[PDB]
Amino acid sequence: SIVKHWAVLDFTASERFNKMPNDFVDNLIDRCWRLGMQMEAPIVYKTSRMETLSNGNAIEELLRSVIDEASRKHGGARPTLVLCAMSRKDDGYKTLKWIAETKLGLVTQCFLTGPATKGGDQYRANLALKMNAKV
């Protein structure tokens, strides 16, 4: 019933423009809670540059370091959902999803910080609905 182990990959941290705000995850968790979906805090928050999505081997390592960090910081827990925040569309996500879901036994969900912030209530509602359906 509860999403105990999940992670955030923030590709927007260095962006400066369209950086995911610091209250966005906690707001999002409140939003899922309102739908009947209880999530704990993500056991891993990791930032990366958008450029990373251009390199498949770097994607694979990024995901594997999320898994390793969760294991070290939370007694061996393994994330299931990995929420990915991006500042613009990037077809690299397609590679990331494949590695994540078919190689690593993860479930991923991507979103754009632009549409999600400032005038984004309906975008955020749709995000919470997709997350709820996935996990």
Q: Which two tokens stand for residue 46?
A: 């990791």
Q: How far apart are CA 18 and CA 61, in angstroms?
A: 25
Q: Which H/E stretch holds residue 32?
A: helix 24-35
**CATH code at position 54:** 3.40.50.2300
Domain tally, the chain:
1
Q: Which two tokens stand for residue 110?
A: 């991507």
Number of H helices, E strands in the chain: 5, 6
Residues 6+ apart with CB under 8 A from 128: 28, 31, 32, 35, 37
How far, in whole angstroms, is CA 27 from its chain's centroid? 14
Q: How far apart are CA 100 and CA 114, in angstroms?
A: 24
Query: What residues make up the domain containing 106?
Result: 1-135
The method of structure determination was: X-ray
Q: Among candidates 83, 68, 79, which has minimal Cα distance to 26? A: 83
What number of CA atoms fall less than 13 Å from residue 48's CA on the CB side?
A: 24
Q: How far apart are CA 17 and CA 50, in angstroms?
A: 13
